[PDB]
UniProtKB/Swiss-Prot annotation, chain A:
21-hydroxyprogesterone binds at F348. This is Cytochrome P450 11B2, mitochondrial. It comes from Homo sapiens. One of its GO terms (cellular component) is mitochondrial inner membrane. InterPro entries: CYP11_CYP27_families, Cyt_P450, Cyt_P450_CS, Cyt_P450_mitochondrial, Cyt_P450_sf. It is found in: Mitochondrion inner membrane. GO terms for molecular function: corticosterone 18-monooxygenase activity; heme binding; iron ion binding; steroid 11-beta-monooxygenase activity; steroid hydroxylase activity. Pathway: Steroid biosynthesis. Expressed in aldosterone-secreting tumors and in adrenal glands of patients with idiopathic hyperaldosteronism.
């Protein structure tokens, strides 16, 4: 019995009342909770009345695995209209995230070696580590000025600035001077534009351009002006490095984009568009998981002490060779795995399937929109015993970890992101105890990225 | 819905508060303990000022000192009260720092406006001034509460074996309820500048 598509349960949602509820609330902050309860109601697969085209929502490793077996040579995601629209309006090309087909593959293969490959990590990870050491030094100096050898603060601003700085050094070889100092205005303008770009993305992504162009034209100008600001920021970084390399081609590693420009395999215009993706995508995606981990570690001091144990043991060798932090802190890497299971920045994986396939023994025809919701996936009590528990051992004992996606489209920035998170934690863990009174669950909110709605007050006590 | 600190209390709620505040705020015993902390900030004021003075060719600086004195007192009191060092002496005013100085000044002005007439009358004669006054207090309470939430959470986890300030003593002893401590801590924070 391979049951026909229609057999599959249907979402009780009306495509139209959803558009209207998004128009009204100016967002969809509860998307993750809705999809979750629907999965509790109707089992691990269901279909959404999209008005003709075929959407299917899953949440099992089982299903993701099959899905990787039907990635074409050109795995395809759905056009994100608002982002592409802006590109075409200002006459830019599209980077890897907004491409499909031949052009995607041509870009991707000329990007993996310098952004994602192990040989690239080895070169940029020391630079990241330099910024992470600086983050903790700056924090230690503040802490030691206090009589109780501790500082209690909302760490979100300084963690966001660390990701800006670490990403910038890795990407462009420049030190912006945003760790252990104040935010610049260019810094805050950039963070603000990212926030607004994301907010407006939700508004415009859930109704065709057809209607949005006249229903919410103010949302369009808002989205474009946010992108204008983001591009202004990213272009200035590009203008700098471009001018510097035109006069001197260095003999030592000075970051990822340099490698791209040096090789000149991609066109400048294609390099420009991919740098903007890396520059824009390297801030919030990383900052938030990092904050959630600090929060979880502060609620679970026993787990924190275990993670401290190993970071102190490896302290020695890592400062000699930073590159070994990947291999030598496997319990800390498990913690990240654990943070992204409970709080996945990318809420759902997405494929418009090029062939027909079978999931949960239902027939899924080609051209179907298939969405894996990692929030519900991560919380399946079956695959994850004691799902609510924050237990990195869970990972040492063992498609259960796919918060970065899968196959050839999987996150291009994965190794950078993981370096940035791992190194900051490691250096913090050698030097500080992290504590909070605010032990209650933080409510996640969905604005394209899935992010904490609240920022708890964390105490950093020097050891 | 906040409690009143010792300044605004009369009667036995007052006496209860006062007798649980004299020892750590006013006594010579408490002064022996915070005076060295205050000395540090004073020393720092004088060094920061000297660095600037010696950069000048006549070996003097000529300025309106008011801003830097106000930042000295904010720093001194915050160290004495909460045992934290704000970084305001020898550096530029932070924006929390300036908002607080402004909020205080507006709170004092509006006080005089509303002070000499009953609420029954001032309600409709000067309602925009009640708004100003309450906004000033919101900002003051915002600043004072940031301070206290920091110390509270620090002291719930570790009781230091040494002196880390006046409000630390009150919280350690916990003779007054939290709400009472918060109320009195606001008066010392607002009143110490
Ligand atoms: C913890 C942080 C991050 C998470 C959880 C994350 C997650 C993801 C996910 C789920 C995808 C979709 C993969 C798929 O469709 O199979 C993706 C793609 C992508 N990510 Fe990330 N990401 C993170 C950080 C970053 C960073 C820092 C960058 C840039 C440096 C980045 C750049 C990209 C790009 C360019 C793609 C598109 C790749 C393609 O379509 O071929 N990501 N990421
Ligand atoms: C992770 C994500 C895909 C990758 C992007 C990220 C948001 C920030 C971002 C900006 C870019 O210019 C490049 C891709 C990227 C890093 C998205 C948020 C949700 C989405 C997904 O959930 C993918 O399945």
């Amino acid at each position: 019995t391979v049951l026909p598509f229609e057999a599959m349960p249907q979402h009780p949602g009306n495509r139209w009342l959803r558009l209207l509820q998004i128009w009204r609330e100016q967002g969809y902050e509860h998307l993750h909770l809705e999809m979750h309860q629907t999965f509790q109601e109707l089992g691990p697969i269901f279909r959404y009345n999209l008005g003709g085209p075929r959407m299917v929502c899953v949440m099992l490793p089982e299903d993701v695995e099959k899905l990787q077996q039907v990635d074409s040579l050109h795995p395809c995601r759905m056009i994100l209209e608002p982002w592409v629209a802006y590109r075409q309006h200002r006459g830019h090309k599209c980077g890897v995230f907004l491409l499909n087909g031949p052009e995607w593959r041509f870009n991707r293969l000329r990007l993996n070696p310098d952004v994602l490959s192990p040989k690239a990590v080895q070169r940029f990870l020391p630079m990241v580590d330099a910024v992470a050491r600086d983050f903790s030094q700056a924090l230690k100096k503040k802490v030691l000025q206090n009589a109780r050898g501790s500082l209690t603060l909302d760490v979100q601003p300084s963690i966001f600035h660390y990701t800006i700085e670490a990403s910038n050094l890795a990407l462009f070889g420049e030190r912006l001077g945003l760790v252990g100092h104040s935010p610049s205005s260019a810094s805050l303008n950039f963070l603000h534009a990212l926030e607004v770009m994301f907010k407006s993305t939700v508004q415009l992504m859930f109704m065709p351009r057809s209607l949005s162009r006249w229903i919410s034209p103010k949302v369009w100008k808002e989205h474009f002006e946010a992108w204008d600001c983001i591009f202004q920021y990213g272009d200035n970084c590009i203008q700098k490095i471009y001018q510097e390399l035109a006069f001197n081609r260095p003999q030592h590693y000075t970051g990822i984009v340099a490698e791209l420009l040096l090789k000149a395999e991609l066109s400048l215009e294609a390099i420009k568009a991919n740098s903007m993706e890396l520059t824009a995508g390297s801030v919030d995606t990383t900052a938030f998981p990092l904050l959630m981990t600090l929060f979880e570690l502060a609620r679970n001091p026993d787990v924190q002490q275990i993670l401290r144990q190993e970071s102190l043991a490896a302290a020695a060798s890592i400062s000699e060779h930073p590159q070994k932090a990947t291999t030598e802190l496997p319990l800390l890497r498990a913690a990240l795995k654990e943070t992204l299971r409970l709080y996945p920045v990318g809420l759902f994986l997405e494929r418009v399937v090029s062939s027909d396939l079978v999931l949960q023994n239902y027939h899924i025809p080609a051209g179907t929109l298939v969405q894996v919701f990692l929030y519900s996936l991560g919380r399946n009590a079956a695959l994850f015993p004691r799902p609510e528990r924050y237990n990195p051992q869970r990972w040492l004992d063992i498609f259960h970890h796919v918060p970065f996606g899968f196959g050839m489209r999987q996150c291009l920035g994965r190794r950078l992101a993981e370096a940035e998170m791992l190194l900051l934690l490691h250096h913090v863990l050698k030097h500080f105890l992290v504590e909070t009174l605010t032990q209650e669950d933080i409510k996640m909110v969905y604005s394209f990225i899935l992010r904490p709605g609240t920022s708890p007050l964390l105490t950093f006590r020097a050891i």
